[PDB]
Assembly symmetry: D3
Homo-oligomer: 166 residues x 6
Amino acid sequence: MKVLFLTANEFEDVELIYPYHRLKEEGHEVYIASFERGTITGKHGYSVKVDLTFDKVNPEEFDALVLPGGRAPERVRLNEKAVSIARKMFSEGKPVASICHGPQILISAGVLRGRKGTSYPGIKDDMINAGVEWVDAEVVVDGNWVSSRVPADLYAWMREFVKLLK
Amino acid sequence: MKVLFLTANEFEDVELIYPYHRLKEEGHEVYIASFERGTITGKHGYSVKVDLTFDKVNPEEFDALVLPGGRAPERVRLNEKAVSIARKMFSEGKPVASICHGPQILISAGVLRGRKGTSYPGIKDDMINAGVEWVDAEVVVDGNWVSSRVPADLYAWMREFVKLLK
Amino acid sequence: MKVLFLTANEFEDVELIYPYHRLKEEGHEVYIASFERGTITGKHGYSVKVDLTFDKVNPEEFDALVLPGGRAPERVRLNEKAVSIARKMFSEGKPVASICHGPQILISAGVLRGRKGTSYPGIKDDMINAGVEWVDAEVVVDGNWVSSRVPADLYAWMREFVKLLK
Amino acid sequence: MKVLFLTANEFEDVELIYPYHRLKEEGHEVYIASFERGTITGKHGYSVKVDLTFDKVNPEEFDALVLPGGRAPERVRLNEKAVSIARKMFSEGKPVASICHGPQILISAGVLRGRKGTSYPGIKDDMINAGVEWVDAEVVVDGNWVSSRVPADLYAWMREFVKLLK
Amino acid sequence: MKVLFLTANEFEDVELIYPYHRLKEEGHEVYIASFERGTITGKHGYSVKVDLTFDKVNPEEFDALVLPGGRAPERVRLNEKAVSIARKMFSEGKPVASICHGPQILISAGVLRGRKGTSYPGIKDDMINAGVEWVDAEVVVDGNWVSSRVPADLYAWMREFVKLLK
Amino acid sequence: MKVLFLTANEFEDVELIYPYHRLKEEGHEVYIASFERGTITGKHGYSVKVDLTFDKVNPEEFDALVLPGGRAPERVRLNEKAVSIARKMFSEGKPVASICHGPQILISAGVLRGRKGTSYPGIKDDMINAGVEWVDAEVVVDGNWVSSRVPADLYAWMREFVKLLK
Ligand SMILES: O=C(CO)CO
Ligand SMILES: O=C(CO)CO
Ligand SMILES: [Tb+3]
Ligand SMILES: [Tb+3]
């Protein structure tokens, strides 16, 4: 499986780095997409290499999608190409993992009405207004959509996501 | 006029400090309300004294409301008392000024359906999903609601808000 | 009115941003002059665009002058052209607003002998030794010179300065 | 399984957080031991709660040990109780995972002579002088000792360590 | 010889630490005085222990005085007791070393008229207005007063100061 | 005398700056060697200019060597040219001063077996395993090798090193 990550500067560091390594453990290939090639830096100063730009992503080449949190999703969700990648992959039923502010990208994609999941609690009202049945749980599994709230939830978030890719 | 500010740690510094001083220039009394007494610190490190807690606010004692941005609104909007203050003041037609992420508190108050305004562009989709006709302008005036987007808009934001309080 | 600001890196952020927006509210044009074009960054990390260099300033083209504080005045006061701009504008009786360390530029211009005003209290002795009757007040108005001490004084500083430009 | 972590302030954040969550995914209980109760803060600013002090650790109550890196191991290795915990657990054949500077604690425990493993390359010479057959690989498995070098190795480090605990 | 240092938070780190150690090399005793007991922290984050408060200093018990720079002198120079210590020691002809902003304390003491020395160039005009014959040199020796400008001057600053204490 | 420093980014600031100025006081020439020309930055943010790269160093052109601490030695000790400079200078009996983590470079050079000295206590075990008779003292003098532990030892470290160069 080829797993795509849509992120940008000010990503929540462990929310990117944890699934990156957890999915590599399984033998999956992992790719970081952002605005430009080079590096991006997390809220806490970890730097990661960008593999490809949003413009170069062909969603048909990727099997699954991860949406880390932090302040990066509010930047990503204004990029039509990044939102279109998330819209396509999610609506096609490919596995999509989101955490914390990550699902702001899915809100903007317009794909969450009637879906069941969670997010950082600070944006619960925005998830509800997008039509989500919002649950206060460490992980929620709604078909292809695996969602979690905060870094304390990482263990449960990927415990469930790895099952979808098997 | 007695002007109330609803804010918390990680407020956008100039979005609090600018209206605070601008309204004092007019002779209005300005009050900072937050979770606890003591001080709160902005994203950029400016410290301000808290005048009263959300619990101690009686909305009937205040004439107008200011909602600065930053990351503070995502904290404030989870406090039922703070959201109730905003709901009451806004729904009674008292002047309410919001900037950047500030109107996340108004989203949570459930008062924006059918209203027109603006915000930080990163949350435009959340404003639209709350029932706002979102306008990309430095300031929008919709009856009692004066809204702006970013720090570059400060001059226009308070130019319009000062007029409502006269 | 065309209002010139003389500043540099490590300016006290709100002491630049507050008068910048306050004077734009009135419809005045505001210009940031510094060592080079591009941007400058405040003590607290706010970035502002430089409109023109000190070398390109013709003082006859500007109606008023603002001198924010921070650590920037100790840099500005070593630039002969910046000091000459301040000397010319102040000595011609044009409105000049200073706050905090801002009047270090006026000290270096040699224009304060026999004048009355204020500054950041830490440099009161230097103001006295330059020939200033130093007053511990939130704002002092001495003809064309409007002076204040610290960020807490912003409201009173521009309340008085706006009156000189009308 | 009950997994003990020996660490301190200035731990490499992801080297603690990654195995903590990865092992919780398996249903293992995870315990952070340090100098004092309260919190410890990583090099990159993540804070974690300390479960127990080194003085309160009874090594017989834990099944496995994790030694994250950063600057914390040079502090931990001067605490004779922490070193004695590592010596006891490692010499009894319990699973021990180390990464980056983590095995400095094992050097001080005097248990690495004739063993095979890796570390941050900057301390390879110190591992060699302690009697280690040093290997430049993302993960090395030498009986109970699973060792890795840097954060890029996380995926492989816990892939192998999880196998020892099953 | 007993050497006193008058300083406070935001001292220029190397301007305190360098003379501290250089004078200990000679066998002199070194004492840090500040507003309160406990620790003070430099601009660059080095922490030093305060030996005594300004209020507890009896200038007759000390043989020489060092005035480091940074932002600390603008705080120290508003403390009547600290200024009185500097006034007494300097006017009695005891060796006094200053660097960078350090001599702002001597300006406030009122002891520099007709004296010859240097400082951080940003405050040269303030030194001149206090009656100093200001010299742009790495070190100036004017009887008991040894003055330097910036951290690059440290070697020459103490080369000359150690000669006065011999 | 021409004194070479082998260092890199994340050097302990005062451990480089202190001997640099102390040795310049004597009239010695001081040279900073690192990976590349330009500047290097300490743990605490002080920046220093690099005079030459490790590749350009001819050890026969330098009379003495200084090895500051911080995290820089773990980078320097993986550069075989830097290690070969230290090996050559130390084994030829030229004066070598080390402090804190500085002697990690000497460990890697393979020159400490049977020698007597000190270091940061956190790496004492690594010094012992390299064949050092490790002493817990502020300064140790073993022929050409002058060693100290921490920044508190600076005064004694250079007191002894200066004697070797005279
Ligand atoms: O129509 C708006 C909601 O009222 C969104 O554009
Ligand atoms: O008299 C002033 C100078 O004119 C100082 O107080
Ligand atoms: Tb051997
Ligand atoms: Tb041996």
